[PDB]
Amino acid sequence: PQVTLWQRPLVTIKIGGQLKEALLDTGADDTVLEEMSLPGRWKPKMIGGIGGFIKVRQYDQILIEICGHKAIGTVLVGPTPVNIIGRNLLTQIGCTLNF
Amino acid sequence: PQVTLWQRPLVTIKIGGQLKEALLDTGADDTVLEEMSLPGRWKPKMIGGIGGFIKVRQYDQILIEICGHKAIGTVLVGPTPVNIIGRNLLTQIGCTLNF
Numbered sequence: 538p539q540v541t542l543w544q545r546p547l548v549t550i551k552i553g554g555q556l557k558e559a560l561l562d563t564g565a566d567d568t569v570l571e572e573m574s575l576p577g578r579w580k581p582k583m584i585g586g587i588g589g590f591i592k593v594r595q596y597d598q599i600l601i602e603i604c605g606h607k608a609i610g611t612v613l614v615g616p617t618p619v620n621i622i623g624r625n626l627l628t629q630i631g632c633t634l635n636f
Numbered sequence: 637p638q639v640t641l642w643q644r645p646l647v648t649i650k651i652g653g654q655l656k657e658a659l660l661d662t663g664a665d666d667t668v669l670e671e672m673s674l675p676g677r678w679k680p681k682m683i684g685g686i687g688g689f690i691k692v693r694q695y696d697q698i699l700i701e702i703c704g705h706k707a708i709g710t711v712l713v714g715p716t717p718v719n720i721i722g723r724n725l726l727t728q729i730g731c732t733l734n735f
């Protein structure tokens with residue numbers, strides 16, 4: 538769909554059985570979800586942003602459904618205020634910027 | 637222009653007589669620029685991101701030329717790693733997300 542930016546670009550994701558809302562974020566290389574229950578194997582990883590760094594759990598090959606579109610990728614789970622869909626996944630659902 | 641997301645969405649901006657590169661960021665509410673010389677008054681503000689909070693100088697009515705589009709708005713200058721154009725200016729240059 539086309540999404541204007543007067544409000545935050547928030548979509549519904551279905552991940553690991555759970556429904557969440559996430560921000561479509563072009564300035565994020567990675568996808569970072571708030572602490573949740575995910576099955577499996579994860580690695581320790583540190584990522585950075587404004588303000589500094591956090592330590593997150595890396596899960597690879599996770600299925601995510603972003604606004605009814607399917608994609609599989611690396612998802613990081615840690616202490617982020619808002620769930621962020623970053624560019625590793627935005628390329629999979631075909632998301633482009635327009636101006 | 638239409639921008640795909642395989643690489644970071646960077647554009648050229650002209651601000652305060654100076655040429656910079658900045659990231660078009662749909663997940664940023666505000667425009668945050670690294671430390672640079674700007675004329676006039678500024679107010680102190682705290683903003684947050686994933687690793688915490690930073691103290692920024694807020695400037696209002698700043699003219700900014702983003703990929704040849706002129707826009708007037710609030711710009712925050714501070715200790716950010718990369719120059720960020722957030723939704724307060726992206727809505728003024730007519731920026732939309734598409735998938």
Ligand SMILES: CC(C)(C)NC(=O)[C@@H]1C[C@@H]2CCCC[C@@H]2CN1C[C@@H](O)[C@H](Cc1ccccc1)NC(=O)[C@H](CC(N)=O)NC(=O)c1ccc2ccccc2n1
Binds near residue numbers: 562566586618
């Ligand atoms: C998620 C991750 C992959 C780690 N990437 C990033 O964090 C990169 C790092 C880059 C280098 C440093 C400068 C920022 C850029 C852009 N960011 C993406 C960038 O989109 C990031 C995503 C985000 C949204 C909401 C909350 C937290 C984080 N947003 C931001 O950093 C902007 C900064 C701002 N004042 O506008 N924050 C917000 O717009 C914003 C909104 C609500 C909030 C609620 C609570 C706490 C903080 C909140 N911050």
